[PDB]
């Protein structure tokens, strides 16, 4: 053992050595080695250490803190996904802290129940318009309801013929009241046809 | 870097008695360094850095500080155990949602002495009646003797007395008496399952007064056709379809049935149940080929009579 540690005084080599102590089941001592590696190699190689170190030490608050220290890319997301289910929203805030990332959070929030997801999009708005259209429209369909309809107007006005079909649908949805706004919507989409045709 | 175990601890302890009074961020970082340097048994500052950061999380508002009280208490629990529970009790009380948050934490603390903790959490006429039936009679009775006191309460309290009395007609009657104060039919159907039980139930339903009468009619019919028709006449008048289904299960099924169908048609194009009940009455007749052919004759007879009726 000491004969081996003499090497530690002086990465593949690192993981190998930690695997030695793991074979001897020194456990905690082994985790220390991963402490000594990561102080060296910085956010690049250190990740290569750190992914196995996490998977292992979790397998054995402490690890939570360790990711906390760690955080200063996808690894953060796997890790956060782990922590929430072994506070959840807190994790979603962390992922929030790019389109694919936005898509994920929304999924996990839906897993915590529906209500957040409509909420998530508002965060989402700030190619992305295609995604806000992907979720905002769904929220409008699901639909506070007056704020949601006015939001449907705010989103339809937020920024394409299918989208014209969308605004036309929103106008048509009214029981003889979404006509004027509907014709205005088709007019705006026509204006988009004008700006599009104007393009060289 | 000079490979000092003890001198570094002297420096670190001699620094962290004055230097955090401002605050303790670099103190926590040097705690992480001391836990790291010890690695390259010795996870003492792991707890001290986490507990200091937990308390360091500012309490703003009431629910925010009470939410943090759930975090640091769980951190203290896993790792003055009574004074941390007392300071946790004042944080939750000093914050609508804390009644459901603390109760959990409070119970856990108490479990981890029992008489004093229960009186603090419980701190109205029906609640005292619920306590006297399942307090002295540890987990479940006392582990739902304070959680229960705070929609399915009359149903759960009736199941609690039935379990406590049996280990009985004294506890079941207390549930049956509290069922009357729709709800009484649930306690009636349960007490009978354990024939007075079959009857009491019937009597109750009768006295009271579409789903409620369907349960009492199906129970008196399954036990072993006279009172099934009597319950149908004083309930069915879904309800029209139920009276047809009652006549199918319970000699004069075709005549009376058809009469009723026609009457319903006249009392409101809407003759789809007369051709359907006649086709099922023909197919249900005992005879295959002869049984199926008879069902076609009975079904077509209703269709011909229905198609020639305005």
Swiss-Prot record, chain A:
HAT repeat residue intervals: 1-31, 62-86
Compartment(s) of residence: Nucleus
Superkingdom assignment: Eukaryota
Family: Belongs to the crooked-neck family.
Role, per record: Involved in pre-mRNA splicing as component of the spliceosome. Involved in transcription-coupled repair (TCR), transcription and pre-mRNA splicing.
Subunit structure: Associates with RNA polymerase II, the TCR-specific proteins CKN1/CSA and ERCC6/CSB, and XPA. Identified in the spliceosome C complex. Component of the XAB2 complex, a multimeric protein complex composed of XAB2, PRPF19, AQR, ZNF830, ISY1, and PPIE. Identified in a pentameric intron-binding (IB) complex composed of AQR, XAB2, ISY1, ZNF830 and PPIE that is incorporated into the spliceosome as a preassembled complex. The IB complex does not contain PRPF19.
Protein name (database record): Pre-mRNA-splicing factor SYF1
Organism: Homo sapiens
Gene: XAB2
UniProtKB/Swiss-Prot annotation, chain B:
Family, per entry: Belongs to the crooked-neck family.
Residue numbers of Phosphoserine PTMs: 69
Disulphides: none
Subcellular location: Nucleus; Nucleus speckle
Placement of HAT repeats on the sequence: 3-34, 41-69, 71-96, 106-136, 138-161, 163-186, 188-215, 217-241, 246-276, 278-310
Residue numbers of the full-length protein present here: 425 to 802 of 848
Chain residue ranges for the region called Mediates interaction with HSP90: 1-167
Protein's recorded name: Crooked neck-like protein 1
Assembly and interaction partners: Identified in the spliceosome C complex. Present in a spliceosome complex assembled in vitro containing CRNKL1, HPRP8BP and SNRPB2. Component of the minor spliceosome, which splices U12-type introns. Isoform 2 seems to be predominant in the spliceosome complex. Interacts with PPIL2 (via the PPIase cyclophilin-type domain); they may form a trimeric complex with HSP90.
Species per Swiss-Prot/TrEMBL record: Homo sapiens (Human)
Biological role stated in the UniProt entry: Involved in pre-mRNA splicing process. As a component of the minor spliceosome, involved in the splicing of U12-type introns in pre-mRNAs.
Tissue: Widely expressed. Highly expressed in testis. Not detected in brain and lung.
């Amino acid at each position: 053992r000491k004969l081996e540690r003499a090497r530690d005084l002086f990465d593949g080599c690192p993981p190998k050595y930690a695997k030695t102590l793991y074979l001897l089941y020194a456990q905690l001592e082994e985790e220390w080695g991963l402490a000594r590696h990561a102080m060296a190699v910085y956010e690049r190689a250190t990740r290569a250490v750190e992914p196995a170190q996490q998977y292992d030490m979790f397998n054995i608050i402490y690890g939570v803190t360790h990711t906390r220290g760690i955080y200063q890319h996808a690894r953060e997301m796997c890790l956060r996904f782990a922590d929430m289910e072994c506070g959840e929203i807190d994790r979603a805030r962390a992922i929030y802290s790019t389109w694919k990332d936005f898509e994920v959070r929304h999924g996990n929030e839906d897993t915590i129940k529906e209500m957040l997801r409509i909420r998530r999009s508002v965060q989402a708005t700030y190619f992305m318009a295609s995604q806000m259209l992907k979720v905002s429209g769904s929220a409008t369909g699901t639909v506070a309801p007056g704020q949601s309809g006015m939001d449907d107007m705010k989103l339809l006005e937020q920024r394409l013929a299918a989208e014209a079909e969308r605004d036309q649908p929103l106008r048509a949805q009214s029981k003889i009241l979404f006509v004027r706004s509907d014709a205005s919507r088709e007019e705006l989409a026509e204006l988009a046809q004008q700006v599009n045709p104007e393009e060289i | 870097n000079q490979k000092e175990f003890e001198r570094v601890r002297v420096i670190y302890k001699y620094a962290l008695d004055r230097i955090s009074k401002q605050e303790l961020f670099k103190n926590y970082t040097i705690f992480e360094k001391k836990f790291g340097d010890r690695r390259g048994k010795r996870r003492f500052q792991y707890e001290e850095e986490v507990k200091a950061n937990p308390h360091n999380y500012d309490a703003w508002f009431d629910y925010l500080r009470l939410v943090e009280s759930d975090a640091e208490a769980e951190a203290v629990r896993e790792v003055n155990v009574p004074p941390i529970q007392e300071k946790r009790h004042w944080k939750r009380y000093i914050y609508n949602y804390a009644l459901y948050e603390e109760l959990e934490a409070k119970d856990p603390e108490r479990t981890r002495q029992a008489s004093l903790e229960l009186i603090p959490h419980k701190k109205a006429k029906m609640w005292i009646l619920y306590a006297q039936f399942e307090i002295r009679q540890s987990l479940a009775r006392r582990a739902l003797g304070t959680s229960i006191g705070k929609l399915f309460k009359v149903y759960i309290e009736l199941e609690l007395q039935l379990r406590e009395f049996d280990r009985k007609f004294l506890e079941f009657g207390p549930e049956n008496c509290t069922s009357w104060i729709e709800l009484e039919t649930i306690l009636g159907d349960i007490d009978r399952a354990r024939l007075a039980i079959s009857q009491p139930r019937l009597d109750m339903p009768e006295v009271l007064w579409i789903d409620f009468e369907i349960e009492q009619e199906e129970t008196e019919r399954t036990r072993n056709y006279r009172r099934l028709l009597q319950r149908t006449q004083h309930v069915k008048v879904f309800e029209l379809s139920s009276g047809k289904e009652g006549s199918l299960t319970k000699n004069k099924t075709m005549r009376n049935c058809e009469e009723k169908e026609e009457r319903l048609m006249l009392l409101e194009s809407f003759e789809e149940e007369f051709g359907t009940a006649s086709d099922k009455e023909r197919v249900d007749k005992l005879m295959e080929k002869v049984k199926k052919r008879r069902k076609v004759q009975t079904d077509d007879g209703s269709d011909a009579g229905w198609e020639e009726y305005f």
